[PDB]
Amino acid sequence: SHMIRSMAYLGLVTPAVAEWRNFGSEILGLQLIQLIEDGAARFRMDEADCRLWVHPGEKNDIGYIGWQLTGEKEARELGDVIAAAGPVITRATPEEAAERCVAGYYWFIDPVGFRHELSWGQYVTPNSFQPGWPMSGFKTGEQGLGHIVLLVPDLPVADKFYREVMGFHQSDCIRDGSRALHFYHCNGRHHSLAIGSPGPGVRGAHHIMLEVNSIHDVGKAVDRCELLDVPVSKSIGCHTNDRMVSTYIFSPSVLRVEYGFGGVEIDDLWEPKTYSRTSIWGHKELRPDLPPAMIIEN
Amino acid sequence: SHMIRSMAYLGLVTPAVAEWRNFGSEILGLQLIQLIEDGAARFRMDEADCRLWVHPGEKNDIGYIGWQLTGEKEARELGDVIAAAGPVITRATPEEAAERCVAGYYWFIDPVGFRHELSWGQYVTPNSFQPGWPMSGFKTGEQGLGHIVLLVPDLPVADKFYREVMGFHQSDCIRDGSRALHFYHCNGRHHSLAIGSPGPGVRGAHHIMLEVNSIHDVGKAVDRCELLDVPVSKSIGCHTNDRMVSTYIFSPSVLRVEYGFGGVEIDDLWEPKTYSRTSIWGHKELRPDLPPAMIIEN
Amino acid sequence: SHMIRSMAYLGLVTPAVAEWRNFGSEILGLQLIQLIEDGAARFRMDEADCRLWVHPGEKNDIGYIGWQLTGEKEARELGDVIAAAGPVITRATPEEAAERCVAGYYWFIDPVGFRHELSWGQYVTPNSFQPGWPMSGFKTGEQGLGHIVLLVPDLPVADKFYREVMGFHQSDCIRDGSRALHFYHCNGRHHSLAIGSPGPGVRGAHHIMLEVNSIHDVGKAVDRCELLDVPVSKSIGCHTNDRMVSTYIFSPSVLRVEYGFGGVEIDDLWEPKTYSRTSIWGHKELRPDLPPAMIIEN
Amino acid sequence: SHMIRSMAYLGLVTPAVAEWRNFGSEILGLQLIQLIEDGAARFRMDEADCRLWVHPGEKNDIGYIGWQLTGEKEARELGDVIAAAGPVITRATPEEAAERCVAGYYWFIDPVGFRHELSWGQYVTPNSFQPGWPMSGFKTGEQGLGHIVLLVPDLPVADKFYREVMGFHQSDCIRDGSRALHFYHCNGRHHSLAIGSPGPGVRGAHHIMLEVNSIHDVGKAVDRCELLDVPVSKSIGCHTNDRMVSTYIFSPSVLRVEYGFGGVEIDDLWEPKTYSRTSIWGHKELRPDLPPAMIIEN
Amino acid sequence: SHMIRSMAYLGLVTPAVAEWRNFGSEILGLQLIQLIEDGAARFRMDEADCRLWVHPGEKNDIGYIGWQLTGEKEARELGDVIAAAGPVITRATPEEAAERCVAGYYWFIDPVGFRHELSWGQYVTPNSFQPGWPMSGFKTGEQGLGHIVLLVPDLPVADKFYREVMGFHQSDCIRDGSRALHFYHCNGRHHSLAIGSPGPGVRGAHHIMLEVNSIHDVGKAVDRCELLDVPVSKSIGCHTNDRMVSTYIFSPSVLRVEYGFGGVEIDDLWEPKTYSRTSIWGHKELRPDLPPAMIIEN
Amino acid sequence: SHMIRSMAYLGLVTPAVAEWRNFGSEILGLQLIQLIEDGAARFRMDEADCRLWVHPGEKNDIGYIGWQLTGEKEARELGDVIAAAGPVITRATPEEAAERCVAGYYWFIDPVGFRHELSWGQYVTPNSFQPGWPMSGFKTGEQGLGHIVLLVPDLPVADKFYREVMGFHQSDCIRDGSRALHFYHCNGRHHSLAIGSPGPGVRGAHHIMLEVNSIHDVGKAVDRCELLDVPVSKSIGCHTNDRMVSTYIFSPSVLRVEYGFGGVEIDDLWEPKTYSRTSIWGHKELRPDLPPAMIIEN
Ligand SMILES: [Fe+3]
Ligand SMILES: [Fe+3]
Ligand SMILES: [Fe+3]
Ligand SMILES: [Fe+3]
Ligand SMILES: [Fe+3]
Ligand SMILES: [Fe+3]
């Protein structure tokens, strides 16, 4: 069936690696592990050996997006579908696969410009994870890391590629007027991916989302940011579609982190809807001075 | 056993009756009914014919606090216990009982100065209640109206009277330094009553609490206040003891209304604890310019 | 603890015995058994050998009301309480107890004039009951036969006697204006007994209630009455207090039978309420030509 | 509260010890352990070190009936109640208590003539019990060994003593005509004790009952008896009161063993009833040639 | 009812404070907090501000045992019972109560020589606890800290005092031959206290027990001890009575810590039993060279 | 769909047949039945007439591995897939099928050299199984006998054959460094088959696994081995992948038996992972003197 099961892992690029190394543990409550051999910050959020890398770079960027598949055959088969649509599929070397803490992966570049990695056999270590501060941990498992929201030059081209080629299913859309956002799922998590287009020629990422196991973690996280002078860009609130109670934290790279609890789950009787608003309540924009997103190209 | 079961109803006194008449429906989402014959605003929150009165008066005040008991015998018996401790017990006339929409009640005055009414056979009308705006209604039943927090001159005198005479059970205490608050229960609701003492000679009320059936009602209520220029005195947050996700709204009388969701319930294996803080997160004081409480006497 | 557990059985008196013999089976769906030696119609509704008698008499009357108690000691002890209040307690002979299909009973007369029988060890025959027509049977067990509603000259005298002496607990009251009805319980069944007073000097019964296991039995029963020319005095509807979906059937004796489904159950967190109406919906009076109740004395 | 909790253990006396030693294991599926020092057969049915003794004797007899109580104080207190009613209470020696595999016991003789032992701290050995043949084990725990049915000269004298003194509660009665049987409970097991009176001057026991965990064990047990020439005195069937699917096996002592599955459990809403029959179905008397009961005295 | 609810907290005395400070966090997985003003190590295991103290001293000793009660009245009332039996009851000063992180406590000395503290209103801080290593935390709540096993000169004197005066209930006994151990409960936890007597004139403690939320924590804890050269005195195994899967760790004071998972819970249908063995399996004595217990007096 | 459902049965070859005959019953707790006509030991573990054979032979060997399929058509169809890949498929004679206590089977030889039997209609006898010692029996049903772990010359050749031809699904891998193990499933049991390669030219088996219904059976089994001088080669512990609490017992043939409780179950949302370790805790190698595996060829 060669389907993407979940988001497996994520690679960020930033000059502000030392600031992210602290941010991940002190604010988000991820577990620091040792750096890569090249000086990237590395984090865990569950039994996986590593789900997030922050690599040194000249600009802020999405280095790579890791997706989970059952095994080699499913990643190969999906690869073939992608290859037929244009992008070159490349099998990772054994030494490359191990750097990503996976049994293996095929990778390719989006028509848009983002690197995706079709992985399997993610390395796990049971009962060794502990958060960077006293919070109740994260909701992963079958729903994976969480989700990422990307900004694309051409919403139809991008939308068609993610659905028709990569095989994501439409969750719902927000059409308020300013923005039109497409939400995609590959499991019970309301979305593993979403896309918007601020305008032509623009590429970037708005946020990644982590789910915590308690609402008090979301509230505490906001208070931790107020205490340690980390920008909260969006007050605690609830989205119209995913129904998740969340805040947005501004990271040392301009990418934001949605810190959320209690998302509505995708069921077999799930019908996509259209919303004219982003939020039911809250999500007040607290820092509109800051850059609205993490822009890669203009 | 002559025990208080729940808080049945509440009587407020204010000059700002017309402002409260609107506030109750437009902000809190109570159902307006017709005024009393004397021009008091009257509200429902469930199947009870009336749980809140706002009577005209020269100053802001707690007119009366209605408590629920099984029947006449239980209210009489509790009455006798109270009478032995000092306060005069008076049986309401039939016409008085009907004004309160109850079968009957005995009333008395606290040593402190608050009027309490031991009632039974509250008038109810099934399947006729609808909120003042689209919210999911209130959690009452065996837990009653909610709770009230009073300010008293002498915390030991007050505490002893509520527990030893009126027969409330201690839930827990907050001792941060500024304040020491006692929480009392008579059912599964974390507290139906709480008391604090800002200083000697002072009497007043801080807030009443209403429980709603959804967290989105709490969030929406805040946004409604921002929209209609009603002061929110405390941001969405969670108390250390009751664990309820709530905001505080400043009413046309200086009394505040805690609008909350999902309180921890009192069980048979419940042990009282001491807390050094009021809130786990949130509950940021947004309007410290306003009067801190509803003061009756200095 | 000597408490009444449920209503065990019922004795009706009527000249129209042959009409009742048919009515019980053809309309209510009770099981006919053989007559007493004296020509009374006898019915079952569950595993009990006999719960209803219809004895020959000159007028319509309540012959006796059977109550259930754990054993001899509990009936004796309750007897002593009653005896102290005025009524003579008499132990039934063995041959009398057997006519009632019970191990034994003490009996007495109400101050009002009704005969009550404190019984125990009711005769049962498992897996031999089948209804008089294809309906889903009756809800009895711990809730017993059902309930009876009596009319009394003096509501306070009657009320005080049933609660303070016989040890019934108040369920709720209806005070519309025309009538004031008291509802009493001794188990999970909303009420086993209720009383009203049309005026001074009047004694009678309005109805007995049977609970069926399906709503379709209530609906079918109405249609059976329309088919066989039996008066339905009250259309399908729902009471404000007991919340039961029911119709009232006019019996060959002027006593009515409430045929109902899905009554709200008395819990340990049960507070009595006051209602200003009898019904939430339905219960339209279809035959106000007929006598309003079964009057015994004027 | 000094109540009997369950039947703990049982002592039988018979000349046919070797026949019982085999019978217990091969037919009933009890676990043989080593004999007492004096040559009694000893069996387990659960984690208890020993629940049944078969002692050598000249005639068939009930040697002793062990009852379970919480501790020494409860057995002493019940002892005092018994002592006041006539029977001498004797504390067992340490060496006697150990022979019974209990921490200690007080014993006394019934007015009727049966020895009862009020015990506590029964010796148990976890996870070492295995049946004498492949059956699904026995239902004990809070319901204990099972029950015994005794025959008494004077049913009122016996009944009064078991209920008013030993503190058993009436479960129900069977009054067919031939026999009148009283059933008593001290826990969820429908009965732990029952009594009947064939005539004056007669004392004996009819049967003991063991509960198995599967109906197939009851059926298999019958077929085992047919195979090994052990008399089945009553075919598989179901009692009117206890509702248990059971057969009766004739033991090497004339005492019968009811081998049963799926008894109706005593609840807090349990009302005693009267039955005119012993069985709903089955329980066909297969061997009326054999002695009807185990008679001790005439 | 003035009953002890649970074990609240514990005070150990040892010269080896620095070794315990590390041991508590690195081996047991408790959370270190700041020392007392006098240099005692302090630990949390749940939301309580502090449940364990390790005070400096010349010898190894049990400094004090904290018990939980509902409030002041219950501790006072139990106090009065104790006072009548001999020991002096002393109310703690406010400053003393705060050192113990409780609202208040009465204390007294056992006839044996152990200090017990009847406390209430334990200080708690929600959602701030994190273990000293990645384990799944501890099972406390209504079952409290866990349990302690003391060694006493005179088992009857001690037993009588704990049950008849302090109001503990007997759980069960182990009588193998070498030892006779009494187990006492005051809640669902199989035991909060147990006592044994190696011989006359001897007083001490064998172990305290902590319950963890996963079996893997017990297994990991053993492997942590093997890694860091901490003596495991008893291999993973299961007790006959409490059924808990546990190991024993030898602490820097000679007191052992039972590290256990999945204890059988005390129910309302709980009967005390007698066992002839301590363990079903495991609990192999790995270090019989070490002192068998923590002896205070000879 | 022609899929393998479970492992049905197993055939071992050893010179030490008499030692295995005892070992199976006394240590593992299997039920002995009569030998084959040729003197093989035969065992049951559930309602199946026979799941394990130990045949006489000159060396230690895996005689045959029985797999379960729905019927003849599914075994034939899978046969055809296998036949196409190289191995000859042979239908068993009726007399051969009966020796295996199955309705019929096709058999073939692995490219590696192991004999596999595709069977159906396994002979069962309900309610006749009892363990060789007092343990709580085995978990089989839809998960079958358990699993076997084989050693192969060429891991890719073997892996490809089991997955692509026999139609097993990958469960997970352990890659520590010394070994790389592949785990395969065909049902809810974490694995029914696993393979490793010590080096080129080597063929053998490490262990078979039996699941018991209680953890105490695993613990008791270890203690039984210590008592009866049977080598335990691996202490109680928990694997990283299957999460089963188990010990390894060294059998009279060099094959080991994993005796385990409480394996994690394969779900529809199951993603294969990679582990860098075999065990979370325990599984200490107690007898490294013994041969590491059962080697068939070098
Ligand atoms: Fe998002
Ligand atoms: Fe409040
Ligand atoms: Fe009615
Ligand atoms: Fe019986
Ligand atoms: Fe212990
Ligand atoms: Fe294995």
Author numbering:
A (entry chain A), B (entry chain A), C (entry chain A), D (entry chain A), E (entry chain A), F (entry chain A): -1 to 296
Can you provide the manuscript's text about this entry?
We successfully isolated novel 2,3-dihydroxybiphenyl 1,2-dioxygenase (BphC-SD3) and catechol 2,3-dioxygenase (C23O-RW1). Based on the position of cleavage, dioxygenases are further classified into intradiol dioxygenases, with cleavage between the hydroxylated carbon atoms (ortho-cleavage), and extradiol dioxygenases, with cleavage at the carbon-carbon bond adjacent to hydroxyl groups (meta-cleavage). Interestingly, BphC-SD3 retained its activity even for months when stored at 4°C. This was an exciting observation as most of the extradiol dioxygenases (EDOs) reported earlier are highly susceptible to oxygen inactivation.
The crystal structure of BphC-SD3 was determined at 2.6-Å resolution, revealing a two-domain architecture, i.e., N-terminal and C-terminal domains, with the sequential arrangement of βαβββ in each domain, characteristic of Fe-dependent class II type I extradiol dioxygenases. The crystal belonged to the I422 space group, and there was one molecule in the asymmetric unit. The monomer is composed of topologically similar domains, i.e., an N-terminal domain (residues Met1 to Thr138) and a C-terminal domain (Gly139 to Asn296), including a 12-residue-long C-terminal tail. Apart from two classical βαβββ motifs in each N- and C-terminal domain, BphC-SD3 has three extra β-strands (β17 to β19) in the extended C-terminal tail. The enzyme BphC-SD3 is a dimer of tetramers. The octamer is a compact globular molecule having a central pore with maximum and minimum diameters of 43 Å and 19 Å, respectively. There is a 12-residue extension present at the C terminus of BphC-SD3 which adopts the β-sheet conformation. This C-terminal β-strand is present at the opening of the active site and is not involved in any intersubunit interactions. Unlike BphC, BphC-SD3 is active in the presence of oxygen, and the iron Fe(III) center is tetradentate pyramidal, with a His145 axial ligand and three basal ligands (His205, Glu256, and a water molecule). The requirement of Ca2+ or Fe3+ probably explains the oxygen insensitivity of BphC-SD3.
